[PDB]
Amino acid sequence: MKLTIIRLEKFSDQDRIDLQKIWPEYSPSSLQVDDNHRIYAARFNERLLAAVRVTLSGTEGALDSLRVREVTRRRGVGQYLLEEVLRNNPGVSCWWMADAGVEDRGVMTAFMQALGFTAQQGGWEKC
Template structure:
């Protein structure tokens, strides 16, 4: 089965269980209650299981990304990169992207990942502008 990136608007019981493995510290029910056109949730699905996810907040033509996370056992296989790239591609009206620096214990790994994804480092996070036609 192919890895697919989907926007989740309503979570199944399996989705909640999978997301609790992706984000063990998050209140999944509270996250689900926030979902609307402005607050979105994208996930990487493989074999009917969620392997990674991120939250997107849309403010005009800006997209703010939060909680980009891939399950530990699935990392280093391109899931995070594909999740990020497809989320950007599925939102063509957003011209400026921002993701917060998360205080990760592996800042060099995060920096390499973000740079490979086309983001530039700033004091508060990482940014990317969609090229204008």
């Protein structure tokens, strides 16, 4: 189906294969999911193309491990994933993403700016 943002609470074996490609450094299910530790993923034609982890603390929210598969970058996937994360957590009024793991901090900043985040020491904020 068309590009869709989903919250993954349980993982199929396809999901497991896809998440290994998106996140080679992590071993599912080292990945914990509960009500405050979320994983959102972009799904397109029964495959995941991008993922991010979300940590909620009421009005504060942290983002880490945002990654879009190299093959499908600059097609708006990253942006749609993040907007759906913001939109579906309307309780959060302050978001943080630390610059950890980021390949290319220059690209990340231009992306986070398009989405309205301000660059700060160690990260990006929208708050």
